[PDB]
Structure 1
């Protein structure tokens, strides 16, 4: 027997509940990067890379 893999869970998200009450919100940006409100995200990668909520102002070369 070579039962290498079974009943496995790799990068999983599964019981999640959120509530958000706002009166105002004023996300505002100039030449930059905003990431906001990220919830319930999963992933798996082989021989690569991973990123979920990445911001970068810029990359000047």
Structure 2
């Protein structure tokens, strides 16, 4: 679970959204008259009508994650 990014030194980014009656549901748990429900979310969740990820790593960049589930 180690992330390293070292940088040694010796544009137009447009997002245009025009929505009418836009409904966004991310991590959602909807139920009625149920018994049990498990919602295990361990990561980076992006949800939406205009989901833009521009130039996420431009220089030295390190991305890491770790999830698990132990029930025995």
Comparing both chains, which one has the higher relative contact order based on Cα–Cα distances under 8 Å and sequence gaps of 6 or more?
A: 2
- TM-score, normalised via structure 2 length: 0.16
Equivalent pairs, count: 61
Q: 2:17 aligns with which of 6, 30, 36?
A: 6
Provide the TM-score with structure 1 as the length reference: 0.17
Higher deviation after alignment, 19-28 or 48-57: 19-28
Runs of 4+ in structure 1 over 4 Å off: 1-29, 40-61
Q: CA RMSD in A?
A: 10.6
Superposed displacement of residue 54, structure 1: 13
Distance 1:23 1:32, change over 3 A: same
Partner SS, residue 21 of structure 2: strand
